[PDB]
Amino acid sequence: ELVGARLIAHSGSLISLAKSPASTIQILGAEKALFRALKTKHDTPKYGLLYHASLVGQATGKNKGKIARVLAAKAAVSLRYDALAEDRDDSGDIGLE
Amino acid sequence: NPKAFPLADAALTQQILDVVQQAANLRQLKKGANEATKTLNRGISEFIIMAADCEPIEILLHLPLLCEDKNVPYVFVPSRVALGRACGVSRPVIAASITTNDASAIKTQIYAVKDKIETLL
Amino acid sequence: XXXXXXXXXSETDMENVCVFAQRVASLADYRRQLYDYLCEKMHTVAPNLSELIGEVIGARLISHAGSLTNLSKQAASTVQILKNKGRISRYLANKCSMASRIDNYSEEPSNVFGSVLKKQVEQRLEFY
Amino acid sequence: DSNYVRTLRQIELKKLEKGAKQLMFKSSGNHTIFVDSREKMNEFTPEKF
Amino acid sequence: NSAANALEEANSIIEGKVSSQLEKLLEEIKKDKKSTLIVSETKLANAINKLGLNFNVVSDAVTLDIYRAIKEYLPELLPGMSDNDLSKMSLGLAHSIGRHKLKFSADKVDVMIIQAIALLDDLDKELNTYAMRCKEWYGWHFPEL
Amino acid sequence: KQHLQRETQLKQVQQRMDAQRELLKKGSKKKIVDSSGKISFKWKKQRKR
Amino acid sequence: KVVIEPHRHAGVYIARGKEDLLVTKNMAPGESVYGEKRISVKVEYRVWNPFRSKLAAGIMGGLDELFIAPGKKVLYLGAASGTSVSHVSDVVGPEGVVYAVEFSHRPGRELISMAKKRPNIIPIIEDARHPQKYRMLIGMVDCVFADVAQPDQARIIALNSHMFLKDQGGVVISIKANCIDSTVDAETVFAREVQKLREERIKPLEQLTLEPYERDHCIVVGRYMRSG
RNA sequence: GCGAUGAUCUACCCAUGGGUGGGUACAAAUGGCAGUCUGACAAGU
RNA sequence: GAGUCCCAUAACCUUUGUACCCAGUGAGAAA
RNA sequence: UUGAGAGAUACAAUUUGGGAAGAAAUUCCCAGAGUGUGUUUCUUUUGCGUUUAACCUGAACAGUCUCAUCGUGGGCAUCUUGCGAUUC
């Protein structure tokens, strides 16, 4: 609940977060590290705001980037299920699977 | 009432999956739901091809909301796996996005299928 | 307007406002209690400075100097406090210096000289 | 190299639509006024109407 | 009665049924069974005849001008009951059926959530600077702690 | 206008290495040549696993 | 700094600075609802630009009698997410209540959340082909403007305007030929639509081609007589 | 019926009425700098 | 494949609402 | 080479109309339109000859082995002097 709140606070509205793709969610925190590196032809950050997620903290080294891609791409899928729902059971079963 | 706006019939899905077969033969088509959002924000999309039997169908319903602001076309095909094979990739694709290229040899096909899905909307 | 409301609306939101508004009430109750402690402890410590200028101004004077002795250590001209502003500001800036002098270098300073210095700034303000 | 060029391109694209926000484009359309009689049809002058 | 739940229940009943206040008004105004009344909708005209009225209920006839005379005297002839400018009570009504026809679960306010985090981060820095102030103040008495 | 002419120049610039970047990946490349001399690349119909 | 100039239509202004814009006096101070610029000159204002507001192209192209007036009630037919319903609230003031109708849920959430801020607008979320379904709300709105994109535009006006409009009232409608035919000339489409409105006791005053902002679009204004 | 327990010094105009000349704390900004990364292989035998 | 915290949870500029007026000298004053 | 229709209009014909000064005519700011000669783009009417076209596709670039991409070296300044593009 704390990492996901910082994504909503960064993006703004809930619907604008679902309209963001998987890469935008993954690099949602480090706009400073991304746009500096894009305009100088360097390497982009791989974590952003998602470093404080629990599953990213379980990985080590190179594995932290690999998890943060899969976690944010699943979070993009999870957020698109959330922001448009009419038959929501409020149990988060799609998030759990 | 339905899941979304228009679902292409048996006949329209021939020509709409003939172009994305020729586009992948040309390697111009961009594939995936998140990559279809990328070319929408860039504004270099031709039209977006979503699938009508996603599990769940919600996870690509964001694309019609990003559609009717820059008026890019969008259809539904009734199978992810059938869209996945016309894309030319072994995994199922729920959302395919043709990119624009004025110097392309699929030009007469790609503007044919543009205007008949304007009528579909 | 209480019988004729005209605004929006829940329950868990309404509980969170009153828990937050109780926190506002407990903060202002504590700040006023700390204020009442402030005007009594310093008036014990430095009574002549408290009598001459005030409770809130002398307390900011000590905090800006960093100690009570550095108000007395500095000259009467370099101290800055916050035709009348051209004369009575510098005249008072002397008076808070000797009030800080008589409140620092004794042990138990009496408030008689703060009242005496109050009469001196009273006669100067009438002269103005 | 592809990331930098699209970043400059999307900068110029966003400044274009921001540049279209405060700009004024004059309209010259087919502003046509219907009439009910032939006597008002041939006596029409826009300075009169 | 202009209750919040009741008027939303009355408005949906006035779109597809016969309301409780309409049935009460029909019984109190049932002077004779040979009375002709022109309803707003044709479906509400048939439902009024099907219910306990036993009168003549007219469909969407030329009485649309009578509906215009009703709405022109809607500020005027309302003073027989209560002279009111109906802008405010129609505003509360229209937002009520709009919030009810929409699903609108009240937890879907992300503007509440985003400044709750901004209140949560301000709580973290304010508790930190208050703990440091209590650190050195009692540390005057007890510096090892 | 300088926003637009810079943007469409950056679009043509981006497309010229984006075709070059997709030229390097995999697959059986084949260089077709137009009669006007405009080169392109058409690929084999192989489904990448 | 900016030279101000009121329009021929009352309640809407043109800010003639070094850059030029079409601008309206605010009713909600310090709040833009889709990211729009403003000029404070005192009274805070709000800008229009016709590329998303089909009424604004009718204003800027030159409209002879804008029946939307600074003291008159407006029926907004087809309230697309409040992108211009908030604008017609700024031009009619707090005097006449402006009515907005819509079907879809995505504009419906945006309308209700913005009509919370604006007491001029009351939103209706019911079908506009059934004026009896929201007959409990309106009596002779002073004018109606339509922006619907469903191919019965003439019927959806004639259904609503026959019993929700004041006699000798004004009716405005936005019609585009890509919605209705999309295969013939645009002028024959608008020629079909004005005889469609002529059969519904509406005398068509003016039709304007919205050429530099919305291709293949139109605005028809006219008077409506002798029913409802 | 002075003072070192500190004397004095540290903009245009309405025959004394406010902006302007302006410079600083902060309260904001749906104001800007400001544009949200690649896109099909990898791991075992 | 791939630069978080080195803070885009912020920095700086601009535009509004507010507050305020441009240390040091040392013996002169007043008539 | 026809039958008309729809215009940008190049020259002229008094006009039509708002404002100003023209005591008496003028004439200006202009806003257009109409008419003839132009000059014209496109729609159909029109007769003869011709039923084949155009594009895509299947296992359709490659032993004179081809194509990328980075480098290197030399030509073309009597000028493919070379674009994040391909000068040979």
XYZ file of C-alpha atoms (C1' of nucleotides) in Angstrom, chain A residues 24 26 31 35 39, chain H residues 34-38:
10
model
C 6.574 4.339 -17.498
C 8.928 1.034 -13.884
C 12.669 11.263 -13.793
C 15.918 12.435 -18.637
C 19.810 13.744 -23.237
C 9.897 19.102 -18.445
C 9.829 15.013 -23.045
C 7.917 9.605 -19.029
C 13.654 3.572 -21.140
C 14.616 -0.628 -24.805
